[PDB]
Ligand binder design. Sequence first.
Ligand SMILES: *[C@@H](O)[C@H](C[C@@H]1CCNC1=O)NC(=O)[C@H](CC1CCCCC1)NS(=O)(=O)CCCOc1ccc(OC)cc1
Length: 165
Amino acid sequence: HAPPTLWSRVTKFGSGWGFWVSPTVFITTTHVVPTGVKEFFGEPLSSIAIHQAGEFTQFRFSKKMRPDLTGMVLEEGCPEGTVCSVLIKRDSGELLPLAVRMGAIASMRIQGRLVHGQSGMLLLGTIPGDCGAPYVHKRGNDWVVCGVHAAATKSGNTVVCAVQA
Ligand SMILES: *[C@@H](O)[C@H](C[C@@H]1CCNC1=O)NC(=O)[C@H](CC1CCCCC1)NS(=O)(=O)CCCOc1ccc(OC)cc1
């Protein structure tokens, strides 16, 4: 049961979504970031610390963009066998949380790109435009985010999230 505040962190961005880890840190999948844009959320690129690798992108802003949020833990993937929720938002507004059992972390070549990824098997499917949606799981009392949606095989039952370096 992801609460409304956790859903409110999922944010429309470029050709997909991103996720507010904290009031200043925003993560997404690199390939959804719009490329001829010089401002993100009213901020100029010069005010954003940007870290990117293996299709995982992090922005750190110079000002509290989402002061309503608490900071939560961002992990480099999760343990194999962890069940995670993919907090998918559709453009219609529909909320679609997908349960996924996470497999191994690995380097992957997907449509010509290197992805530092973690595979997962769904337990509905994903579509173009869902990329950047967060992979989250509960750590007892709290929620942990550990990936952003990147790919789903030809089949449909396996998904890939990019994870931090
Ligand atoms: C989001 O942009 C979209 C989500 C995806 C669309 C179809 N269903 C989904 O969940 N992701 C893609 O379209 C993805 C884009 C690439 C772009 C470069 C960076 C990586 C992602 N392409 S794809 O259609 O998902 C590729 C399908 C093949 O999937 C795999 C998965 C694992 C793997 O490792 C061996 C190889 C290929």
